[PDB]
Design an enzyme around this catalytic site. Structure first.
Site, PDB file in Angstrom:
ATOM      1  CG  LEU A  15      -1.928  -1.165   1.288  1.00 49.18           C
ATOM      2  CD1 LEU A  15      -2.790  -1.052   2.538  1.00 49.18           C
ATOM      3  CD2 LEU A  15      -2.792  -1.225   0.039  1.00 49.18           C
ATOM      4  N   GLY A  16       2.044   1.208   0.561  1.00 46.54           N
ATOM      5  CA  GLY A  16       2.918   2.359   0.616  1.00 46.54           C
ATOM      6  C   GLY A  16       3.874   2.241   1.786  1.00 46.54           C
ATOM      7  CB  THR A  17       6.755   3.913   2.785  1.00 47.06           C
ATOM      8  OG1 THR A  17       7.233   2.990   1.797  1.00 47.06           O
ATOM      9  CG2 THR A  17       7.745   3.968   3.940  1.00 47.06           C
ATOM     10  CD  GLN A  19       5.147   7.147  13.368  1.00 46.84           C
ATOM     11  OE1 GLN A  19       3.931   7.334  13.370  1.00 46.84           O
ATOM     12  NE2 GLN A  19       5.942   7.594  14.334  1.00 46.84           N
ATOM     13  CG  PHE A  20       7.229   2.757  13.377  1.00 47.75           C
ATOM     14  CD1 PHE A  20       8.343   2.944  14.178  1.00 47.75           C
ATOM     15  CD2 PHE A  20       6.037   3.356  13.747  1.00 47.75           C
ATOM     16  CE1 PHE A  20       8.271   3.716  15.323  1.00 47.75           C
ATOM     17  CE2 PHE A  20       5.957   4.128  14.891  1.00 47.75           C
ATOM     18  CZ  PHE A  20       7.076   4.308  15.680  1.00 47.75           C
ATOM     19  N   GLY A  21       7.859   1.791   8.648  1.00 44.89           N
ATOM     20  CA  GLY A  21       8.183   0.880   7.571  1.00 44.89           C
ATOM     21  C   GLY A  21       7.040   0.778   6.579  1.00 44.89           C
ATOM     22  CB  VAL A  23       1.425  -0.382   5.285  1.00 45.99           C
ATOM     23  CG1 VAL A  23       0.081  -1.009   5.623  1.00 45.99           C
ATOM     24  CG2 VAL A  23       1.939   0.455   6.447  1.00 45.99           C
ATOM     25  CE  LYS A  37       2.470   0.900  10.383  1.00 45.26           C
ATOM     26  NZ  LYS A  37       2.453   2.309   9.903  1.00 45.26           N
ATOM     27  CG  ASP A 127       2.732  12.036  15.870  1.00 45.81           C
ATOM     28  OD1 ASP A 127       2.548  13.232  15.564  1.00 45.81           O
ATOM     29  OD2 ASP A 127       3.456  11.266  15.203  1.00 45.81           O
TER      30      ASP A 127
HETATM   31  N1  LIG Z   1      -4.607  -0.179   8.029  1.00 50.49           N
HETATM   32  C1  LIG Z   1      -4.307   0.484   6.762  1.00 50.49           C
HETATM   33  N2  LIG Z   1      -5.156   0.381   5.748  1.00 50.49           N
HETATM   34  C2  LIG Z   1      -4.855   0.999   4.602  1.00 50.49           C
HETATM   35  N3  LIG Z   1      -3.773   1.741   4.312  1.00 50.49           N
HETATM   36  C3  LIG Z   1      -2.944   1.821   5.353  1.00 50.49           C
HETATM   37  C4  LIG Z   1      -3.136   1.219   6.625  1.00 50.49           C
HETATM   38  C5  LIG Z   1      -1.941   1.615   7.378  1.00 50.49           C
HETATM   39  C6  LIG Z   1      -1.598   1.256   8.844  1.00 50.49           C
HETATM   40  C7  LIG Z   1      -1.442  -0.067   9.232  1.00 50.49           C
HETATM   41  C8  LIG Z   1      -1.133  -0.378  10.560  1.00 50.49           C
HETATM   42  C9  LIG Z   1      -0.973   0.652  11.506  1.00 50.49           C
HETATM   43  C10 LIG Z   1      -0.627   0.353  12.979  1.00 50.49           C
HETATM   44  O1  LIG Z   1       0.050  -0.586  13.246  1.00 50.49           O
HETATM   45  N4  LIG Z   1      -1.152   1.267  14.003  1.00 50.49           N
HETATM   46  C11 LIG Z   1      -0.906   1.123  15.446  1.00 50.49           C
HETATM   47  C12 LIG Z   1      -0.035   0.164  15.972  1.00 50.49           C
HETATM   48  C13 LIG Z   1       0.152   0.084  17.325  1.00 50.49           C
HETATM   49  O2  LIG Z   1       1.023  -0.881  17.877  1.00 50.49           O
HETATM   50  C14 LIG Z   1       0.384  -2.069  18.297  1.00 50.49           C
HETATM   51  F1  LIG Z   1      -0.277  -2.637  17.242  1.00 50.49           F
HETATM   52  F2  LIG Z   1      -0.508  -1.794  19.298  1.00 50.49           F
HETATM   53  F3  LIG Z   1       1.320  -2.947  18.768  1.00 50.49           F
HETATM   54  C15 LIG Z   1      -0.505   0.944  18.157  1.00 50.49           C
HETATM   55  C16 LIG Z   1      -1.369   1.901  17.629  1.00 50.49           C
HETATM   56  N5  LIG Z   1      -1.553   1.976  16.284  1.00 50.49           N
HETATM   57  C17 LIG Z   1      -1.129   1.987  11.092  1.00 50.49           C
HETATM   58  C18 LIG Z   1      -1.439   2.280   9.764  1.00 50.49           C
HETATM   59  N6  LIG Z   1      -1.191   2.369   6.577  1.00 50.49           N
HETATM   60  N7  LIG Z   1      -1.819   2.451   5.429  1.00 50.49           N
HETATM   61  C19 LIG Z   1      -1.258   3.206   4.308  1.00 50.49           C
HETATM   62  C20 LIG Z   1       0.257   2.991   4.262  1.00 50.49           C
HETATM   63  C21 LIG Z   1       0.945   3.774   3.110  1.00 50.49           C
HETATM   64  C22 LIG Z   1       0.487   5.253   3.023  1.00 50.49           C
HETATM   65  N8  LIG Z   1      -0.931   5.443   3.352  1.00 50.49           N
HETATM   66  C23 LIG Z   1      -1.764   6.371   2.555  1.00 50.49           C
HETATM   67  O3  LIG Z   1      -2.911   6.510   2.825  1.00 50.49           O
HETATM   68  C24 LIG Z   1      -1.174   7.175   1.372  1.00 50.49           C
HETATM   69  C25 LIG Z   1      -2.176   7.639   0.304  1.00 50.49           C
HETATM   70  C26 LIG Z   1      -1.229   6.470   0.005  1.00 50.49           C
HETATM   71  C27 LIG Z   1      -1.538   4.701   4.463  1.00 50.49           C
END
Ligand SMILES: Nc1ncnc2c1c(-c1ccc(C(=O)Nc3cc(OC(F)(F)F)ccn3)cc1)nn2[C@@H]1CCCN(C(=O)C2CC2)C1
EC number: 2.7.10.2
Length: 258
Positions: A15-17, A19-21, A23, A37, A127
Site C-alpha cells: 500500500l505504501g510506506t 511510519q516505521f516501515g 504497509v 505493517k 502524535d
Molecule cells: N490499516 C491500513 N489500511 C490501509 N492503508 C494503510 C493502513 C496503514 C496502517 C497499518 C497499521 C498501523 C498500525 O500498526 N497502528 C498502530 C499500531 C500500534 O502498535 C500495536 F499494534 F498496538 F502494537 C498501536 C497503535 N496503532 C497503522 C497504519 N497504513 N496504510 C497506508 C500505508 C501507506 C500510506 N498510506 C496512505 O494513505 C497514502 C495515500 C497512500 C496509508
C-alpha cells in the site's frame, strides 16, 4: 496472546510506506482482509514496544483502527490491523469527494470519539494528526499510531506544528496536549489537508506558537465550529476542555444541522 503466525499471512500488494516501515495488504489465514505493517529495522525501540503492545492491543473502540496481532518472533516485526480502503486521512482530504460541511464535522466526531475513549483510559496519543488517521470504505475516520511516538528512534521537527506551548518548552505531554493536537486536526479537516503554518519553518512555527499565534479560521468552518477547535488552544493546559466536552459540543452542532 496477541501473537499471529507469520506463516498464516499473505502479501498481495504494497500500500505504501507509513511510519516505521512498509504497509502491505493481504489475507489473514486466507479468510480476513488485513493490512500488515513491517516495522523497519532500526526505526523503533522494539523491546519496549513489544511489551507495551499488550496494553495497546486491549484498547477497544469502533473509531480506533482494530488491531489483530503482531509477529514479534521474527524480524522485521509485523502488525496486523484492519484494511482501511481509503487509506490515510491527509491524502483523503487533499482529494476533492466533494466534501460537504456536514461530512467534515462527521470526521471530527469520529476522531473525537476515539480520543474520548483514550482519554477515559488515560492513554495519550502524543502524535494526533491527519497523517495518523485512516478512512475505511464507508468514509469513517479512525485514529491510529496512538502511543507510538514514545518508541521512535531518531536516526524543531515537523510535529511542532501540532504541539502546545508546554510541549515545545518542557515536553510536558498530557491529556491536554492531545486536546491541542485535536484542535489542529480539526483545522486540517476543514482546511482540506492544508499544512498548519505553511508559511513558516518548524523553528518559526514554534516561536509563533510560544507567542500565542493561533491558527486562523478555515473558510469551510463556521464560527460555531471554529469556537470548538479554538477552545482546544487555551494557553493554560488546565483550561482546555476534555474530549468529553469536545465530543459533547460536536454532538450539539450535529443535532442542530439535522
Ligand atoms: N490499516 C491500513 N489500511 C490501509 N492503508 C494503510 C493502513 C496503514 C496502517 C497499518 C497499521 C498501523 C498500525 O500498526 N497502528 C498502530 C499500531 C500500534 O502498535 C500495536 F499494534 F498496538 F502494537 C498501536 C497503535 N496503532 C497503522 C497504519 N497504513 N496504510 C497506508 C500505508 C501507506 C500510506 N498510506 C496512505 O494513505 C497514502 C495515500 C497512500 C496509508
Amino acid at each position: 496472546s496477541w501473537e499471529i503466525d507469520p506463516k498464516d499471512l499473505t502479501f498481495l500488494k504494497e500500500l505504501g510506506t507509513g511510519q516505521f516501515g512498509v504497509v502491505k495488504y493481504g489475507k489473514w489465514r486466507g479468510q480476513y482482509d488485513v493490512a500488515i505493517k513491517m516495522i523497519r529495522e532500526g526505526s523503533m525501540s522494539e523491546d519496549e514496544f513489544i511489551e507495551e503492545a499488550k496494553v495497546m492491543m486491549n484498547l477497544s473502540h469502533e473509531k480506533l483502527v482494530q488491531l489483530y496481532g503482531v509477529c514479534t518472533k521474527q524480524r522485521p516485526i509485523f502488525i496486523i490491523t484492519e484494511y482501511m480502503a481509503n487509506g490515510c486521512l491527509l491524502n483523503y482530504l487533499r482529494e476533492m469527494h466533494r466534501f460537504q460541511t456536514q461530512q467534515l464535522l462527521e470526521m471530527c466526531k469520529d476522531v473525537c470519539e476515539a480520543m474520548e475513549y483514550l482519554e477515559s483510559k488515560q492513554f495519550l496519543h502524543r502524535d494526533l494528526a491527519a497523517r495518523n488517521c485512516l478512512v475505511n470504505d464507508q468514509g469513517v475516520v479512525k485514529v491510529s499510531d496512538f502511543g507510538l511516538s514514545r518508541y521512535v528512534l531518531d536516526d524543531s521537527k515537523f510535529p511542532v506544528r501540532w504541539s502546545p506551548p508546554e510541549v515545545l518548552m518542557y515536553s510536558k505531554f498530557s491529556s491536554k496536549s492531545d486536546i491541542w493536537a485535536f484542535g489542529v486536526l480539526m483545522w486540517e479537516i476543514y482546511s482540506l489537508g492544508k499544512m498548519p503554518y505553511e508559511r513558516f519553518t518548524n523553528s518559526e512555527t514554534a516561536e509563533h506558537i510560544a507567542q500565542g499565534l493561533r491558527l486562523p479560521r478555515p473558510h469551510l468552518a463556521s464560527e460555531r465550529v471554529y469556537t470548538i477547535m479554538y477552545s482546544c488552544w487555551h494557553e493554560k493546559a488546565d483550561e482546555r476542555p476534555s474530549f468529553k466536552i469536545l465530543l459533547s459540543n460536536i454532538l450539539d452542532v450535529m443535532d442542530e444541522e439535522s
